[PDB]
């Protein structure tokens, strides 16, 4: 009786229509384990003794004539179930399935990062509690956590009488999430933000914080599900998952065991048939993402779900790394045509950018090789990046800036601009993004060195048109204008300054000069010494007249002046003045060392310059025999000046990451030192798994 099957399946599945999305795996809880719903929509006969309603249902789906004889109401129910299963991704029986396809259709505005449209929708009116729930999640993603909390409270106050269990559950969970996040954020403000931001940010006043602290004290979320009516818990066993304090509990363990199985496969080099471990964990990842974003769960902003997606996406990416060069064996490739390789699309880009922290992305780069995979949907990624860049420009330009949104957003924007190394962008979008990066990214969360290296990363797939060099000119001119003040200095976290901006422009535009820098230099005076010292770095960016004036107004009688002059090519050789000056500086440091022996050995600060002098001695740059007198500090000094006398057990492997290929070629050619470095490299690679050492060994195959 097909009518009985339609009635049964409708009674089981129709109440789930209220949810915007239903997880595939969790469907098994709906029928009380009568069936097994695999993640790819295939569905496998579970231990049961039923009429087999699903086989008959798919039979009606395949045959039009079979469904043509159904009654009107039963046919409408079948149509509703058809569109539901198509939306979720349930396809057909496991046996009947011979070839299926996956998809990626996360349909949340909050997911996409189109903050302008989110704000527009927030401005628009509302007609349904679903719209208010959407707006609450949107505001929380936009950082207005006071407004979001108030709107969530309003949602609860409406839902208690609207008689909608799902919306009441989801809003309760999300209000608890916004309370937890606002409490943690204000604690971070009170404690650290004074020290970090340099000011006492208090977006939430004390009275409102006390209000939320007192409003729902002793609110145990683990009893929330139990506290709901019988119908909801009976028919929403799917939603037991979230109600725990530790949401992502079972799914975290399942991801752990799937990770274990995937790592076992990688170690063994085993071949997986049917649905691989990677496919199932990927589908579960995407199911969770769609579930929480389409249903608008604020829990996605927490460290629990951030870590969950980080682990899932990492697992997919490292598995793809393995599969790009996996064991062939002549049999695996023969079973299926071509390969279902992993390519990073827009949704994967959003996942990695938002849900990772920057250190996590650096981890992925160190472990995997993201430049070697293929990217798709470049238009969508360009839209995402333009949204990000124009958002930061619009907000940070204005004195007004929701600081809590800044905390919830700067991670995402940082990660997006950091991970856009592998994407192609239009000249318009590239120009706007670099302008935002160079001007309106705040100094507190992005310093000069990080700014330069991130720009340099952004200019990988696309070279520099005239617009980019123009905007860099504008930024550097602004920095020069601001550098007049005697109580202002450049601090770099990475260790790269505006001289690297100039080097970037001059490398990407050999014939280039700036009239703004030339005219700001032409009106300089000896009183403003710091500005002269700063503009000394940007010499090739000046005109001939400005160059002559700058040379006349100041000499290079200094060590930093010496380094800046050699770096931008002012001096091709070291004059007696320069070698005398560095000898004097090393003498004063040596007497400081002699005085400090009793107080303790200190060599970290100038060691950069000791290493530089040692390499210069190695490279026939310094031709004075006095240099030998100051052997005794092991900071890459003896390494270069007297490699024979250096104690190699004090060698650090990380000293080979910094040397350029010219110096690597030179050090590769020495017969008094090569053996120790090569054996250290070979045992390091044998005992370690870093690709940079592979690259060095390739340069030192000798």
């Amino acid at each position: 009786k097909d009518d009985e099957v339609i009635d049964y399946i409708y009674g089981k599945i129709s109440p789930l229509f209220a949810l915007q999305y239903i997880r595939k795996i969790d469907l098994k809880h709906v029928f009380e384990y009568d069936y097994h719903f695999e993640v790819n929509g295939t569905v496998v006969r579970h231990k049961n003794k039923g009429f087999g309603y699903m086989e008959r249902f798919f039979e009606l789906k395949e045959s039009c004539d079979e469904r043509s004889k159904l009654s009107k109401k039963q046919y409408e129910r079948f149509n509703a179930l058809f569109n539901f299963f198509e939306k979720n991704g349930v396809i057909c029986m496991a046996k009947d399935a011979g070839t299926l396809n996956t998809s990626i259709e996360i349909n949340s505005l909050a997911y996409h990062g189109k903050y302008d449209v989110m704000k527009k929708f927030i401005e628009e009116q509302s007609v349904s509690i679903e719209d208010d729930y959407k707006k609450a999640f949107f505001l929380a993603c936009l950082g207005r956590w006071e407004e979001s909390y108030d709107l969530y409270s309003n949602i609860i106050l409406n839902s208690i009488d609207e008689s909608n269990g799902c919306v009441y559950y989801l809003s309760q969970i999300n209000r608890y999430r916004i309370y937890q996040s606002i409490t943690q954020a204000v604690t971070q403000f009170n404690g650290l933000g004074l020290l970090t931001f340099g000011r006492h940010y208090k977006p939430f006043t004390d009275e409102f914080l006390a209000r939320i602290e007192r409003e729902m004290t002793n609110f145990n979320i683990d009893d929330l599900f139990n506290g709901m009516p019988f119908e909801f818990q009976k028919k929403y066993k799917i939603l037991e998952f979230l109600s725990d304090n530790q949401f992502l509990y079972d799914d975290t363990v399942k991801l752990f065991e799937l990770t274990n199985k995937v790592r076992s496969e990688m170690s063994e080099g085993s071949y997986s048939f049917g649905m691989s471990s990677d496919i199932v964990v990927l589908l579960r990842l995407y199911d969770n993402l769609r579930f929480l974003y389409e249903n608008c769960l604020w829990s996605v902003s927490f460290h629990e779900f951030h870590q969950y997606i980080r682990n899932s996406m990492s697992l997919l990416i490292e598995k793809a790394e393995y599969e790009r060069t996996r064991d062939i064996d002549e049999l695996g490739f023969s079973f299926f045509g071509k390969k279902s390789g992993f390519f990073m699309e827009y949704y994967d880009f959003v996942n990695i950018s938002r849900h990772f922290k920057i250190d996590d992305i650096k981890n992925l780069e160190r472990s995997c090789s993201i430049d070697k995979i293929r990217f798709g949907e470049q238009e969508k990624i360009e839209e995402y990046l333009v949204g990000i860049a124009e958002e930061i420009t619009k907000q940070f330009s204005a004195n007004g800036m929701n600081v809590v949104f800044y905390t919830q957003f700067i991670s995402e924007a940082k990660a997006a601009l950091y991970f856009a190394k592998y994407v192609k962008l239009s000249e318009e979008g590239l120009g706007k993004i670099v302008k935002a990066l160079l001007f309106y990214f705040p100094e507190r969360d992005l310093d000069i060195g990080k700014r330069y290296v991130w720009l340099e990363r952004l200019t990988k797939c696309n070279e520099l048109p005239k617009s980019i060099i123009s905007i860099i000119d504008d930024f550097l001119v602004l920095q020069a204008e601001k550098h007049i003040d005697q109580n202002y200095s450049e601090v770099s976290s990475n260790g790269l300054y505006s001289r690297d901006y100039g080097a970037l422009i001059k490398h990407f535009e050999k014939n280039f000069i700036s009239k703004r820098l030339s005219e700001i230099t032409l009106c300089l005076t000896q009183d403003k010494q710091k500005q002269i010292d700063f503009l000394f770095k940007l010499l090739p960016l000046l005109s001939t007249n400005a160059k002559s004036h700058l040379l006349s107004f100041k000499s290079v009688e200094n060590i930093n002046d010496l380094m800046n002059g050699i770096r931008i090519g002012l001096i091709d050789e070291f004059t007696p003045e320069h070698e005398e000056l560095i000898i004097e500086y090393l003498e004063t440091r040596k007497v400081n060392y002699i005085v400090e022996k009793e107080k303790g050995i200190q060599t970290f600060s100038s060691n950069d310059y000791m290493s530089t002098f040692g390499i210069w001695y190695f490279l026939e740059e310094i031709n004075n025999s006095k240099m030998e007198e100051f052997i005794g500090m092991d900071d890459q000094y003896d390494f270069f000046v007297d490699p024979e006398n250096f104690d190699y057990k004090k060698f650090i492997p990380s000293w080979l990451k910094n040397y350029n290929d010219k110096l690597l070629g030179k050090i590769a050619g020495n017969k008094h030192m090569k053996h120790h470095v090569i054996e250290v490299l070979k045992e390091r690679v044998k005992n370690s798994n870093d690709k940079r050492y592979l690259e060095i060994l390739m340069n030192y195959f000798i």
Partner: protein, 145 residues
């Protein structure tokens, strides 16, 4: 048998020397790599070479306790002072301590909020060492011996 390096970190302002907070260190990373221009894009000449390599240092702490006066009084620069004790392989329990400190450390945390659920306390304050045109890097090593 456990590691006898339970270091204590003092976070003091650089301008005058006021203590900001005391804590016990949790993790500390030295990063040493080049991204100047491309993997090989340094500027130079046949007879010229400049070690433009840049080093970024990061730190973090645990058991972070703020001072009453610093919280009461509320281009800033700050310093961190390590406090450990030496323990040579040849000689154990070396009375001579070991001092490390970064005169210029930026309290720019890679983490922003770390929104958790559980009632777990782990306030890790992630710093990073800065630099200047006058000094390439700021940290200092010193031992009582």
């Amino acid at each position: 048998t456990v590691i006898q390096d339970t270091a204590d970190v003092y976070f003091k302002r650089k301008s005058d020397g006021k203590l900001v907070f005391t804590a016990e260190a949790q993790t500390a990373s030295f990063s040493q790599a080049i991204s100047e221009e491309k993997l090989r894009g340094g500027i130079g000449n046949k007879p010229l070479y400049i070690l433009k390599s840049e080093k970024e240092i990061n730190l973090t702490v645990k058991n972070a306790f703020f001072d009453l006066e610093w919280l009461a009084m509320t281009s800033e620069r700050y310093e961190v002072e390590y406090r450990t004790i030496a323990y040579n392989p040849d000689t154990e329990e070396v009375y001579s301590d070991i001092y490390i400190q970064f005169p210029n450390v930026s309290p720019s945390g890679e983490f922003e909020m770390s929104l958790e659920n559980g009632n777990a306390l782990a306030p890790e304050i992630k710093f990073e060492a800065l630099a200047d045109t006058d000094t390439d890097e700021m940290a200092v090593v010193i031992e009582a011996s």
